[PDB]
Design an enzyme around this catalytic site. Structure first.
Site, PDB file in Angstrom:
ATOM      1  N   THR A 173      25.522  45.606  43.284  1.00 21.72           N
ATOM      2  CA  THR A 173      24.119  44.646  42.857  1.00 21.72           C
ATOM      3  C   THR A 173      23.545  44.508  44.122  1.00 21.72           C
ATOM      4  OG1 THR A 173      26.026  43.211  42.130  1.00 21.72           O
ATOM      5  CG2 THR A 173      23.668  42.334  43.094  1.00 21.72           C
ATOM      6  N   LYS A 197      31.773  31.189  61.669  1.00 21.72           N
ATOM      7  CA  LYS A 197      32.970  30.009  61.954  1.00 21.72           C
ATOM      8  C   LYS A 197      31.836  28.526  63.194  1.00 21.72           C
ATOM      9  CE  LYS A 197      36.745  28.203  63.052  1.00 21.72           C
ATOM     10  NZ  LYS A 197      37.482  27.480  62.853  1.00 21.72           N
TER      11      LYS A 197
END
Ligand SMILES: [Zn+2]
Ligand SMILES: [Zn+2]
EC number: 2.1.3.2
Lengths: 144, 310, 144, 310, 310, 310
Positions: B55, B84
């Protein structure tokens, strides 16, 4: 027990009053509030009841009650009299209070408000997530 | 303007029959006569939070073919569960002051949509958001169908494989169903049938669809035969057991196909299409893949260039 | 009406009434309940107030309120009359409602009730985890 | 029965002074006169959910020295933060039906205590639960001090190193505080000083303590110098070298030290004790280690054997 | 000699009913009156080519309980081959010159049987060979049922969960079928129903069995409810939640259950049994686990000790 | 020439007030009217020995905006401690025959400086050298201050957070102090005070600075409020304990800010800036980030283009 000016939410189902108080942060105010839980009602069995002074609900705020207390009545009160009366209608969208059942939905970890499109069905209500575009029975979304 | 200028392309379900047409028209135009300087001086971000090489190569090539510059990143088996601290929202809020458009792929359904809420005026193009959407895949599919058949109405289209999870076949079906007169033929290993919402959708639009168990039933009548990709965990050794071969398409299965029939597969394929079909005139999945650069050029052209004159 | 038989928790600080209703699952009951939030009180500024029919609080249940509403009063009610009256004293242990500030405490992921030893200090209350044996200001344990 | 028969040994704070002496007396007896068949027919489980080879070796040797049989396991990087299926509770629930006692070491704090809640009448001995307790380490420390000074009261004790994270010295401090006339000296790089609640506890008991910044200030007048292990990650690598050379001990730092003084260290050490101190009469860290198997024998013996033979 | 002295224990199917009772009787004897010196001077090899800590602990405990000595190893997943060089055959050829019996667990099916072909007169006991056999798990299951119902015939037995992959229940079914008057109930999400050759075997023996889809239908009338462990990979994560809540057990599902019924589970469980059933008289899975060391003691005893003392 | 033509940009401390000004002027110029062909036919290496996505995307975009071509690499959790054999010096010796400039980021303090000793005539630009320098971050900070305040003299600037390790606040303070009349306000969680060399530097130049413990004290007077980024290991649960909220800036904290007051943060932020400040006119961290491409264009322009006419 009634008030001078404000809103009265009558005919809430048992065990929904506290839910409404929680979901809509209704007690995060300085205004006087009066709540009745598990009151008798020949009208419907038994009911919860909320009274908030000097506070008013827009048509849509009222409509947001529809998923939890469809047959409630919302009375406006001035000088101790009922001035207005309305009932909740299913809204087109429900924001902020549901959480997507999709564990992978981007909407969990990030700083955005949840949002669902609301669509009436035969035996339930369909809720479609703005974000992940999945659709769920309100039964699934609402049960935890 | 043009209807798509400065719009996000997040989901197939947001695009009209007209929109679809515009994209395909543009695609073909660009395919015929290139505009390698159409987006000179644009910088595009190729943000692949989830690695997907096929892709990304396609998309990036398209950007270069139109003259734009590309910056970005492919991401990795994430140590310690992510950036995070850093929200996607902060990431898009920042990246969107650098660049002119954001092409992004992400492991979470809804990521593309959330990006738009922070990208400002910078259009974001969805290259894959978990199991939700993959609009350019669908657009290149449509474009391949239109180019080889001369049309997107009155077709006979068969979907084959995992219909329960084949997000490709859901999208493609939705799209074709924005068009008149198509008839559908669904073929699964009994297990993995088609989502009921899709079938319900077909019925209201009033569209013919038939269920089947092998391709033989349907081969003589179809114009497109679209195969899904099929995982090792999607299925098992026990339900590959008595009927696993129609799951393996072979050149021999094609003897009675119409001359115009093309076989598309979004790729990659593992064993579901045997290599002996590769040599037939019906094999068209590689060609399909190269059409992706036109679908993608088209989207980028229309979204960044106010009035796109063919 | 009012009263007939049960418990009345009076003199709850503002914004604590709803907290109490939540923490101690007080509305998970069929009994009739009556709640007053942000009521006027010349006695202490303004107050919350809870009334639960046919329900009574052990000395320790009443003590469990001490951390949130130290100056509350707990009245027992029979035939509409205040029969009993008590005030919350700091307990020795607080179980079930707090959660350990320690991200690594074993108590998080596992099927056990939280537990803390309570110790009065100069300017705060010290809470010590049964499990990880760390000690915290109640300010830290209580603020989220 | 003796006071510790069938009791869990989880935390130093759960033991009276009486208890401590009871353990130490038994250690001394066992060291003097071995009982290689005291726990004959007992089966002990050595459960190290977090690997610690110096700890397991010591403990398992204690077990075999009393004639007990040993089974167990060492876990592999507790890869992540748990066994993904089994709750710790279930695990103890099961193990407590196989064996006569459990010795466990675990990354989470409170794990030992939790085990007691599912182990029935099987005693558990905590061999380290994250950063909370390690009682046999403290007991071995205590025993070692008493043996070499002849007493556990009115002693001059130095602690050196990472006093903020060093749980070894916290515990030893706490337990030495159940004794009279003891005097502490704390040596630390400022941003690593001894946690306050300790000192508060010390002032409140009337315990003489002095904060210092170099070993020299006090070397002349201590009976125990107990060293912990300063890390290369906790302090950063610029400030490290600028103040490192006083938390390192050489023989040349021992010129004015008392002829009764012993240097202790829970181990292992890296550079904080130069190897030239090894040959001196003060080095006692290996001796200390050896005493581990007597502290640990003592504890197993008292717990599993109803009445002790001194 | 007893029938099992010096025999390999590889597959449940290699045992008569006589055999089974022999094992179960010995288990009961040993549980009542231990023989901690029965295998004194024997050395057993605990060979876990595939790690399984709950299995090794149990088995090794059994060994020490009979006073045997234990040597062995647990292998480490797979960098690639744990072995590469050594054929399994060579490995057994060698080990069978060190030891008195071999207990092995291996990822390939048939590995235990293969071992018997190179172990000389050294008996091998299969502790799990891929997805084929695990006899001591079955035997411990059997013993547990008998102890709690007083009999192994004319019983009402439920199996629940992943009945297609759950070898634990296949084996238990097979061995319960060497008994008269027993009646089975199989509870499974449809695409996970009990393999047919089992049922064929059951019809052919005249064994009453009923396929169901919820625990409720039968709860009122069973003596044993044996649960297996449904996976989050096997069924996908969308169909999972839609039918998951009947392959989960809560105390509230036990209102109409018999006062003799016990709930079994080979362990470990994750969510398939809520912790609220733990406190009820029906929970017996931990008990069951405990019985493991008796089933296994019995087997070792019978195999290595020529004549049994009941 | 222009003073910076063919120079390395390694450290803030190497740059005059004039240098600083030249960069900022250029930046503004370019920001106002782009020169997308200014570095046509240059090839720049984007050498990221340490991965840092935000920094790399910015730098690369800048190169593209000025028409240069980019090659390079982002590096990885290094297997076996590096290229191991290959010295950085060999690496720079080779690369510097390919390209026209080197922009590099490296985990070791001093790497950018070493590169220049092997780079020949190829300018190297420091993108981060361990905890030493990060000049472009500092230049984009200055540029944002100048752009929004109309000036870099006579300002009231507050630094907030980890002042011990905030290399961003050290740099920015140094630079601002090359300018007249600024007054500084430092705010820490008691712990993590400012490096004494900085303060000593301020005193010689004769510059006002004040220490404080919350922002309230200082909010009504500041023109810039600069927040550091703050790690999980930089601090702990125990010193997040009584005063951690001024470490969390909220919209409510901003009621009395001067209208002109901007909040800058070098990013990313985790919790130290609440999202409700995002909507205030004071929030300027995203704008700050986008200014990076001008600071960086500027540097690149000046260093590679002999006489830069605005
Ligand atoms: Zn969603
Ligand atoms: Zn804790």
């Amino acid at each position: 027990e009634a008030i001078k000016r404000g809103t009265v939410i009558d005919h809430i189902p048992a065990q929904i009053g506290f839910k409404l108080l929680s979901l809509f942060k209704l007690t995060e105010t300085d205004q006087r509030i009066t709540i009745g839980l598990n009151l008798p009602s020949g009208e419907m069995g038994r009911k919860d009841l909320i009274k908030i002074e000097n506070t008013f609900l827009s048509e849509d705020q009222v409509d947001q009650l529809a998923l939890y207390a469809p047959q409630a009545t919302v009375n406006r009160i001035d000088n101790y009299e009922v001035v207005g009366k309305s009932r909740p209608s299913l809204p087109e969208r429900i924001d902020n209070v549901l959480v997507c059942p999709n564990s992978n939905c981007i909407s969990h970890a990030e700083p955005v408000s949840s949002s669902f499109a609301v669509r009436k069905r035969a035996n339930d209500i369909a809720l479609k997530c703005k974000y992940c575009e999945k659709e769920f029975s309100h039964n699934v979304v609402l049960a935890n | 303007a043009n209807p798509l200028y400065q719009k996000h392309i997040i989901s197939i379900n947001d695009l009209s029959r007209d929109d679809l047409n515009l994209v395909l028209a543009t695609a073909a135009k660009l395919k015929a006569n290139p505009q390698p300087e159409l987006l000179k001086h644009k910088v595009i971000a190729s943000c692949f939070f989830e690695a997907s090489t096929r892709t990304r190569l396609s998309f990036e090539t398209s950007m270069h073919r139109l003259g734009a510059s590309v910056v970005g990143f492919s991401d990795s088996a994430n140590t310690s569960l992510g950036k995070k601290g850093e929200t996607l929202a902060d990431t898009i809020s920042v990246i969107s002051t650098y660049v002119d458009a954001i092409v992004m792929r992400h492991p979470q359904e809804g990521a593309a949509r959330l990006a738009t809420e922070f990208s400002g005026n910078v259009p974001v193009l969805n290259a894959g958001d978990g199991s939700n959407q993959h609009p350019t895949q669908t657009l290149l599919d449509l474009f391949t169908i239109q180019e080889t058949q001369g049309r997107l109405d009155n077709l006979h289209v068969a979907m084959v494989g995992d219909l329960e999870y084949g997000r490709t076949v859901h999208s493609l079906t939705q799209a074709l169903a924005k068009f008149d007169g198509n008839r559908f033929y669904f073929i699964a290993p009994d297990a993995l049938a088609m989502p009921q919402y899709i079938l319900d959708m077909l019925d209201e639009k009033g569209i013919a669809w038939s269920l089947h168990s092998s391709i033989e039933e349907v081969m003589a009548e179809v114009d497109i035969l679209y195969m899904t990709r099929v995982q090792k965990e999607r299925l098992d050794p026990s339900k590959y057991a008595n009927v696993k071969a129609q799951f393996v398409l072979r050149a021999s299965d094609l003897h009675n196909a119409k001359a115009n029939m093309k076989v598309l597969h979004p790729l990659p394929r593992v064993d579901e299409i045997a290599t002996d079909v590769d040599k037939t005139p019906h094999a068209w999945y590689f060609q399909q893949a190269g059409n992706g650069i036109f679908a993608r050029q088209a989207l980028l052209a229309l979204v960044l260039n106010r009035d796109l004159v063919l």
